[PDB]
Design a protein around this ligand. Structure first.
Ligand SMILES: [Ca+2]
Ligand SMILES: [Ca+2]
Ligand SMILES: [Ca+2]
Ligand SMILES: [Ca+2]
Ligand SMILES: [Ca+2]
Ligand SMILES: [Ca+2]
Lengths: 304, 286, 287, 287, 286, 57
């Protein structure tokens, strides 16, 4: 027998008490290449994979529920498929800095774990990694969301086709409970090639020009966004030179003739999840201009 | 030792959400935790470069009549980088609470507890342990004047003198500014989708980390392009509660704003001016 | 000795020369942001490993000038590398900070937080640098002062790597707002930005920007177009203007050479800021 | 760490510049009354708590000038903040007091009674301040001396409070009698009061008095009325008179601005003292 | 240690109250205790800033014939601020004594015993442990020449050199000065109600903490107003035992007094010039 | 007895401020529960026992 109050009190009890930790593990293929005989000249950077939960598929999903993750074990296996008579060599190693962009044989062998071997032999690279807690959500500093990257370079010239596959065996512990939208969980990518406005087409441009191993082997219909603005020289149609400013790209698949592919600029309307295309570039007697400099960061924004 | 422990209780922030305004989802406080925001710690932080959090609890403290019959959800998100104010995001955090508008509650978050900087920087995961967001869960019947209190203890490490315009938290845009959304001289604050900007007082000046391009004309049918890096908040009122922003020039020495050129729209192609995730530091003194 | 080494050394950070009567209360004589590369013996070690953490820092001032010179300075180590406030009071706040006459050497012995840092520079600078030593005047110098600043350091290098010589130099934050009023058609003054690292940067130097440099231009026809440049190049100053001047354009990267690519139009425009306070200028040229 | 903190730091107390040949035996170069606000890092902490007690005090003189200058000084810490006797012998009585040549830095290491003090200033000043550092000449200075005085302190702050930035600056006792002979119609000379804090106060400053300033005036008609003013405002001195000048009137407080409100009449009156030795001038202006 | 203990016995003061003068209540010594007043301690205090009282006793010592048949009450009031000389106030203190004029007695007070300053200051609770008052209780038959002695011990703490005009005790007025009590050039000391002022020697100069306004005339039927801050004592005699005070100007450098303007009373409204509780420091050297 | 410095006659002061806007009439009362020890014997007239007040206008 209790009285009738003005207002009863809340009885929302079990709130804010979600599952906290999860250890979770597996083995995931982290890349695959095929090199035809001539290609594979000494030093050709066959692979370069920045490690992030998202690259390890199964993990990538769990990571959308927690804010931190910390690596408990990693190894990579190399496992090229090729017969004994192939006389080419590779060198792999895990670079513990995710920012380090200089890929030399010399800079790998330097890394702990690094391996060297002819194409017909498998290898395991038991690397050195942070074992501290990084973040699942991408951020401004990369050193905080990734433990480093795995690169593999040719060492001689392959006589024949090389079918390498590079598998990463992981185990990791997810630390912090939270809900992180799949747009922010993507890894940022740095270009290593200048984009000149002399090297263009009316509505697209080459992906090899940017000189980035990820953006080269990036998938179709894949909308990106940039940190730096892109300067498009358009016209009113009186012979008039006007200036347009777009922030977003769109990947189109490549060819056997054009290994890397195209990139159509435009507008990624995010409120409605759609992608408009960018205005007709005005070819003109305009001074040579770097529209996007070396080191432009490109972060994937569309739904994954 | 050279390290200094300091503890207190301090009002993080105070909103009034008036009668009938506000609907499930409506963000009523979104406060990025940095020492400036915590009053007494505010001054202690101006002395050292580095702080570390020892204890943090927020006590919610809403003030309304007993018959108010709305509701709120509060919680503390540990990622100063994570930009997601939904209920679902909040309910996922530890500490999170829900109550009627007449009930105080105490959120008990989990936080970094590691060594952070006092002055703002590029990566704001080193300036802050996270951010507290409090949202509406119903429609409030009455005026509520919520005052969120924070009991805090911290350890301050290296002595320093700190520029107070630098101590402030960077605000991030949540919505894109399109060129076709500009008026001749201004635009509506609400377009940027940011509560802290929307509630920043009249005359606040902000610097952008991205250029604001303004197409203008001389009046000859000739379109030209200007660039601006500063915004000035012009206060919101009942008709336009978010208020407005004018672009222009902030003179850092004289601490003065000069309004920029008028926008001229002349059959321009669709453009994104200020993409979502444009960063907006408070540069003007307080 | 596979992964950790201790190194100690001392090494010159920077040299400055103050012409007679130059400088005044608060004139910033040297702003040296610390990084393994700037300190010479160390820089060679930091190329070997990719992680380093500071264990002792000490700076010795050693300005050389006649006994009569009679101006003054104040020096200190400022542990945030992000901190751009170069006021006297803010420098005297730093632990170990010293104030003395131009003919008195001194030793600043600070405290630093002794975190693990990275050798190769990345976006957030509090992970690549323990801070920055600043020295500034406190009166008018009567005579020429040729000041050298030394740095005694001991440090622990940790993760074996081999870096490339290009990524190791730390970027520069602009301190002052560059108005378009101040532009000249071929070039602009270095002092306008107000960054002593820029003001001192040797000529033939190339700096990439993080914000776009928006250049106005016209081939002719009384017609104003608009252009974009991400780079700058230093052209040495002369006794009249010691600051030096910056010329924009194009830094072809495969080339290993600058191309001015500068076109300007001086006209009745509304006053603008092209490169605002906080612009990040990374050193991109050959080394 | 709820109520007590120890803080240590060192901080500039004051800077002075002596023009060449200015100053003479006993010229008071700096009279700095100590209060947490005057020392910079500390002043921020004293805003957090409302009680503080001093644990170490030390001052370093660091005057900068050429090696030839050849005048002298004497410095000491004088523990009564009430003590206005600025004689040499009275300064040399203070423990730790030092005498040296203008081109010799020194360090005065005094004894203080280490009582608990208040941060917010109130009526009795021996409860808000540990004392006042004084420095004065002992010969004619041959050259310009740009003297900086530093203060190394450690202190214990005690009762949690949050003070307002207006009440913290400590008031000033006038040292000299202000006769009405010395009045000018719009303003009066600062040196007449003889208080070095007033003589140095920056312009646009406003000071409320504890005694009334009685101003004579007339709209005309050969008729003498009498008026009353509680405030003063500093107007900067110029090389001819470095003292500066004081203009009376009205400090509207809601306004946050001064109004001169000065009318004077110069006539055959009997010589009078308007503001006698000991007049207390609190700094009231915006901060 | 740096602290110096010092003890002695010294005459605090000496009054002669002549034959037949004096009646129950008549204050015959009112002495605010500060080291200057205690002879040997006087000099020791000029060296340090701070003193603290370790022991204090007063021995009363009156000199008259055995048939004198008057009486006195003595005691020590611990509040240098308390201004109340009545018997009732005295009898309330600890130590208080009563005797016939021919009898010495010893008052044993209770006192602050804490750390005090040597030089005078605004709050005089930090400069003194209290004050001793001795009053008449009857009418004295004969001349008595009372000499009150004080045995004291003290601890002096920080070394200093002290200006001797500063060491003196501030005197407080007990009675208001009304404008209608002024003569042309002076007024009677007795109006101010203060024994220490009344017995201050000829030529003593006093600075006031409150302005003395003097209305004067040029001789045209025109009233004007002057201000003064200094008084000069002009000695009392049998006809006017309290003596007189002239207003004027004290020149602090030359140590000279200049008499002020004549008072002109011309149908003025009643006014209070120097309210009770006006403070009066001795500024002239001794 | 009151004096020149207040820091010596009072331990501090109790203030209460509004925090929102009251919808209705507010009847607040503020009670102090005290215990104190009186130390020194003497007779103080009621005129000097009053507390001083500072204007703020
Ligand atoms: Ca996150
Ligand atoms: Ca800092
Ligand atoms: Ca590296
Ligand atoms: Ca206080
Ligand atoms: Ca003294
Ligand atoms: Ca009393």
């Amino acid at each position: 027998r209790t009285d009738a109050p003005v207002s009863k009190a809340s009885t929302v009890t079990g709130f804010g008490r979600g599952t906290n930790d999860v250890h979770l593990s597996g083995m995931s293929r982290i890349s695959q290449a095929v090199l035809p005989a001539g290609t594979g000249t000494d030093g050709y950077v066959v692979v370069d994979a920045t490690i992030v939960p998202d690259l390890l598929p199964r993990l990538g999903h769990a990571a959308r529920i927690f804010q931190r993750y910390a690596v408990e074990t990693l190894e990579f296996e190399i496992q090229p498929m090729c017969p004994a008579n192939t006389g080419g060599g590779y060198v792999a190693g895990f670079l513990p800095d995710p920012t380090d962009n200089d890929h030399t044989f010399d800079a790998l062998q330097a890394t702990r774990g690094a391996v060297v071997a002819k194409w017909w032999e498998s290898r395991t690279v038991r690397p050195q990694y942070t074992r501290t807690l990084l973040w699942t959500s991408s951020g401004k500093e990369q050193r905080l969301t990734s433990p480093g990257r795995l690169i593999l370079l040719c060492v001689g010239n392959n006589t024949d086709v090389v079918n390498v596959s590079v598998l990463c065996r992981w185990s990791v512990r997810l630390s912090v409970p939270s809900l992180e939208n799949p747009e922010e969980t993507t890894a940022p990518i740095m270009t290593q090639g200048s984009l000149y406005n002399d090297s263009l087409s009316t509505n697209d441009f080459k992906s090899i020009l940017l000189g980035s191993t990820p953006l080269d082997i990036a998938p179709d219909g894949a909308v990106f966004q940039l940190d730096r603005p892109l300067s498009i020289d358009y016209s009113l149609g009186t012979g008039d030179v006007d200036r347009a400013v777009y922030w977003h790209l769109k990947k189109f698949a490549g060819n056997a003739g054009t290994p890397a592919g195209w990139f159509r600029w435009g507008i990624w309307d995010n409120f409605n999840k759609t992608f408009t295309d960018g205005v007709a570039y005005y070819s003109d007697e305009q001074p040579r201009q770097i529209l996007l400099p070396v080191g432009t960061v490109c972060t994937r924004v569309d739904s994954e």
